[PDB]
Every structure is written in C-alpha cells, then in structure tokens.
C-alpha cells in the first residue's frame, strides 16, 4: 500500500491521434446503429 | 408635377362590413366589384418539429 506516488502518467505520452487511434480500436465492438429511414434529413 | 382632371380619385370610404358597403353605393348609384375578404388560413405550428428523429422537417441551423 502507498498513497505518495500519482500514478496518472499515461497522458504524457499521449499524442495528437491518439483520442482518434482509440476511437477506431473502439469501432471493432460497437452495437449497429440505428437507422432514421433517411440518407440525410434533405434526402 | 402631377396633373388630374379626376374629383374622385381621392375618395376613399370606410365601412363596418360589406353589406353596408353595398347599400351606400346602391344607394348613390355607382356600379361596384365586391371582393370577398380573405383571411390568412390557421396553420399549425410546432417548435419540436424542427428536430424530427426521422422527418425532413428538422432545421440545419438555428
């Protein structure tokens, strides 16, 4: 046990994708979307 | 500047409601058009149609 070390450094290697990198690790698992019925609400 | 030989082209004439309206030019022996008064139609409005889930009504900017 020890509460003198902040763990959180994974930020500082973080880069400019790296939100974008996981967003497209994460579209692997994703329920289907749902549909409107539509191409676009001006279809 | 701007000439007329009209007396009348200045009249103008309020009534209450066209059968009034009717009777003074009768009356006075003028022939007359009636037109029927229009009236703007009731149209229904609705501010949460302007983001329909499925509906073209939805606004692309507000």
Request: hydrophobic share 25%.
């Given at each position: 046990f020890?509460?003198?070390?902040?763990?959180?450094?994974?930020?500082?290697?973080?880069?400019?994708?790296?939100?974008?990198?996981?967003?497209?690790?994460?579209?692997?698992?994703r329920?289907?979307?749902?549909?409107?019925?539509?191409?676009?609400?001006?279809? | 500047?701007?000439?007329?030989?009209?007396?009348?082209?200045?009249?103008?004439?309020?009534?209450?409601?066209?059968?009034?309206?009717?009777?003074?030019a009768?009356?006075?022996?003028?022939?007359?058009?009636?037109?029927?008064?229009?009236?703007?139609?009731?149209?229904?409005?609705?501010?949460?149609?302007?983001?329909?889930?499925?509906?073209?009504?939805?606004?692309?900017?507000?």
């Open positions: 020890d509460n003198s070390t902040y763990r959180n450094l994974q930020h500082h290697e973080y880069s400019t994708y790296t939100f974008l990198d996981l967003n497209v690790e994460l579209s692997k698992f329920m289907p979307q749902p549909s409107s019925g539509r191409q676009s609400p001006r279809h | 500047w701007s000439s007329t030989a009209d007396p009348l082209s200045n009249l103008v004439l309020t009534f209450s409601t066209k059968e009034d309206a009717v009777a003074f009768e009356k006075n022996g003028w022939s007359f058009d009636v037109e029927e008064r229009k009236v703007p139609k009731p149209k229904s409005k609705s501010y949460g149609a302007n983001f329909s889930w499925n509906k073209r009504t939805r606004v692309s900017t507000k």
